[PDB]
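Slack export, channel: ligand-projects

TW: morning all. Re-posting the request from yesterday since it got buried. We need the structure predicted with the small molecule present, not the apo form. The ligand is magnesium ion; the SMILES is in the block with the sequence. No rush, but it would help planning for next week.
GE: picking it up
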Amino acid sequence: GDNSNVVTMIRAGSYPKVNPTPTWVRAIPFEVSVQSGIAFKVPVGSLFSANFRTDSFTSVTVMSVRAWTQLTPPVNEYSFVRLKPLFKTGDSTEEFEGRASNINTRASVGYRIPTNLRQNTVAADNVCEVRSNCRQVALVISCCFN
Amino acid sequence: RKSTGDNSNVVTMIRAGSYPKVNPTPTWVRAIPFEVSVQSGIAFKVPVGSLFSANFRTDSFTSVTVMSVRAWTQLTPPVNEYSFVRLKPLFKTGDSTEEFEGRASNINTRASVGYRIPTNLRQNTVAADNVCEVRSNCRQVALVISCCFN
Amino acid sequence: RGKVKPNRKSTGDNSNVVTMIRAGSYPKVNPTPTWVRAIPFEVSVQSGIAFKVPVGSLFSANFRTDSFTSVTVMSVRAWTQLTPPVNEYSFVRLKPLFKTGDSTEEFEGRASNINTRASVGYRIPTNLRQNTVAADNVCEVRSNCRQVALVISCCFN
Amino acid sequence: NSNVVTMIRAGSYPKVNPTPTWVRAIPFEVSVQSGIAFKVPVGSLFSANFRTDSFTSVTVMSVRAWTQLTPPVNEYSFVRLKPLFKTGDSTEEFEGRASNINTRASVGYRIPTNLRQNTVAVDNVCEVRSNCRQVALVISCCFN
Amino acid sequence: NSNVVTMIRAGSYPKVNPTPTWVRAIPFEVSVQSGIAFKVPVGSLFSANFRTDSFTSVTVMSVRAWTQLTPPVNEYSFVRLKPLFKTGDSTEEFEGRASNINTRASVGYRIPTNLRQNTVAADNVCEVRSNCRQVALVISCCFN
Amino acid sequence: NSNVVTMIRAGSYPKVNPTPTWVRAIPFEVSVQSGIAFKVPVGSLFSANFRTDSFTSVTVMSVRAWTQLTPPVNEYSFVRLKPLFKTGDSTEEFEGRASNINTRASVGYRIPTNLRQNTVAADNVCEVRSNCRQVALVISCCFN
Amino acid sequence: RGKVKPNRKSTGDNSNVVTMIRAGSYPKVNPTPTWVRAIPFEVSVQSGIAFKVPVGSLFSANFRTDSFTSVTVMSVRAWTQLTPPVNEYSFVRLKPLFKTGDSTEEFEGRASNINTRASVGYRIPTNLRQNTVAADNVCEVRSNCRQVALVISCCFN
RNA sequence: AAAAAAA
RNA sequence: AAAAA
RNA sequence: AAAAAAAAA
RNA sequence: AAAAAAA
RNA sequence: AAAAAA
RNA sequence: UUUUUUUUUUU
RNA sequence: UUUUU
RNA sequence: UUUUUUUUU
RNA sequence: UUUU
RNA sequence: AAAAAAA
RNA sequence: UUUUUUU
RNA sequence: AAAAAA
RNA sequence: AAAAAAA
RNA sequence: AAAAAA
Ligand SMILES: [Cl-]
Ligand SMILES: [Cl-]
Ligand SMILES: [Mg+2]
Ligand SMILES: [Mg+2]
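GE: finished. pasting the full token output, ligand included:
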């Protein structure tokens, strides 16, 4: 073990259980385009792509969403970003907002989904609404692909 | 061995007794964020009515017990200057003459400052009242007020 | 024992004169040994295309590593060397490359301040630490900045 | 101990392998000239004189050298070893000199775990330099 | 341990140095005439055969010397070393003799910390005296 | 404590020294051209602006350097230091770069005790290289 | 006590400047002191005859012991400096000599290898450690080799 | 368990 | 001391 | 994981 | 124990 | 466990 | 790395 | 856990 | 400690 | 938490 | 080293 | 570390 | 117990 | 505890 | 509690 320098025999037993398409817990980074004064609905379909090795999945259980302002804010302003979680059983009305204390620095915020509200979502569904004075917002979402 | 049980999967029955004491419109401790417009060299009185709003779920209240006030500069300062902000607490029994000032050591960084109201001065304030005066070289200031709505 | 040949080594660890070394048989020597190094050099990237970092950049007279023809890379760290495009924050991606098979990871770091560099690195496992000659590549660098700084921890042999 | 045969209560047919591996130290000689390096081939390890004519690959761990013949007149024996690798040859020259003219010169080097891959007969182990006409080599390897 | 690449959460750019120092033990030989001292030049340390040709100065810490060739007939090998300094040469003759005619003669001297300054190629390390025509040197020094 | 003068029962006359040594941390700036090294003169330490114009020699212990002006457009500030010695200049380029374009770049090097000798005004401390036109220096040294 | 004259002796054992020494009365001095030494020199012997080693060989500019006229010998060690005759192994004999009375011992060492030196020594007791001038002899050396190396441990005064 | 905050 | 995986 | 093989350098 | 994952 | 050394 | 209130099983 | 004195 | 044979949880 |  | 276990 | 049956 | 020295 | 004061 | 510094 860890000191061997050649191949060694494994005394395997019966054929085991198998699963060629298991689950995967991931953190998916991507960006969205946002306009001023309007809220953008983040689609779940942005997670199922070949760029994330997840084009083979058709459902996902989201756990937490984190957002950063990807582009600079308007002139004389500080960056901010808001998040309103969305659920098929009932959308929420929260506005988890974080503002940058430096014009040159991003504005970050996030929210964690409780265990009772951690069901599956499909590409047609939406995660949350994003609001910002910046034009582009980078998102990092922790979730469990299944 | 047999004593593992706090994860329920089905509905359980609640053996309730007499009718309890209820209150459909209780109090609420909050941290209300909002912004105000500020002019150069001119002090702006922050109205308490800014706290009662549907944008804060507080439009149903008519009075509030303010505990502490914090302020951040919301826009950039003038050219060559660092951001600053001042606060002067106001009270219906007698306004204060303190100017708690917090400046910015970085021109690109907000200027922050705040004050805490003592227990002896934590009374209700209606919308017509004012919380404090705000002075800043920036044209807009952001506030976060820890208050108890009732 | 015996008596003295006066080499005045005062208090052992504090002599001010040359002292005789009682040498013995000729030892094992190596005029060209190995050298574990952290080599700082810059590579240039275009906005939207990848750039393969040649291993030959490590061997140079600017690094004293000019007598080597092979090197074992341990870990690669990257920093954006130039400012990002307007309105944008800095970012840098690293995709490890190996002769036995290129990888597909994109270890990315993004600067939260437009004036600050974006940094990210990756460590090569022990089972993949073989030699790489000048004709080989280390990794693929992507960035919105025109130049990326690299500090490669490696062993020259 | 015993004096007669005993019964073994065997069970299922175990995992077998008619051609296993073998960790060895292979002693063989090479011819070296003055001022020129000799690339020791890995094919020298595979031979019927070492019970390794059935192996096609091997994993070298450490290499040791000894001057097999007397040095030139007025000189002391020395021997150099430059490790060679398919992913990239080295430039080290691990050298050992003899302090007595009538005594061998000994030197050796160890291959790290990260460089211990298989080498076929076409490959080379190391370059051997010596002022002596022959060098004795004892190579600790793992035949597979 | 790990079998794949792992991310390194790097931070700010660190302090770098592409041309660092190097502590070495340089082996080289010199020719020695009978009854004559040879001033070992410092420039012998700077060479592409030692990977040190990129340096221009070096801090010598200790010097060791062996006889590289056989002594004259009926004699035992000997070797002497006289430390040389730009601020003032010494007059010590650290001598070492062999107890077997077939064996080398070895001797050395350590430089005190107060006398460990830089030396350039034009400078000399020490004077060497021997009945043998060549002397093997191993100098522990600090390239900078 | 005491509120008035108190007598000092002095004895014999003591050993005096009107011109003693002084350990300092001298701050001064130098101009640096792009792509060119600047030999920092030792004489910059001897000045009435540092109270050290009464000295003629100084023992440098450590050297630290910051970028005093802003870098060129789109670049991050950097600074290099090459230690210089009369007994032999070095080839190290202790470089430090900034991670923020608006922030200085800092780097330094410590001189070993064996290389801590006196230097006069004509001598040079180190070579400095930077993309900025000025470099702020703080040199820990011993005036004597 | 009082206040300071600033001699910056950093951490006591690590000052980088000259520091004042508070000297007092003039001490006891000796411009020509003693010197305990181990003097290496060679003497030549013939096969079958003895050779008296003069004490004057110790005083020389080659040993820095040129200003001395007397010396106290403590111990004598000998080594054959040249090869032995053919078929023979090396041997060396030492017979101590003293002014108060020569001795008759023959402390002999023989080399078990024809290529190796033959070594032997003798220590002089404290009751016999007086001074010997250049006109005196140390010991008688016998050997089959033509030259014998001597390392004499002594005190020069 | 859920609402200021704190290095 | 009882149940239902 | 019995022997053969580098060594805690 | 290795890799992916939250402060 | 690199390269130097009471 | 340390709290005020809406309900809230259990020691 | 779930259902029972 | 490692490579192959045998023991024992 | 997913694997044999 | 021989019978019925070896936990 | 269980033990009990003829050389 | 030689010759130098917080 | 500060200053003046005896060995 | 001055001025320098793993
Ligand atoms: Cl011949
Ligand atoms: Cl069940
Ligand atoms: Mg950048
Ligand atoms: Mg002899």
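GE: first-pass observations. The longest strand of chain A covers residues 24-33. Chain A has no helices and eight strands.
TW: perfect, thank you
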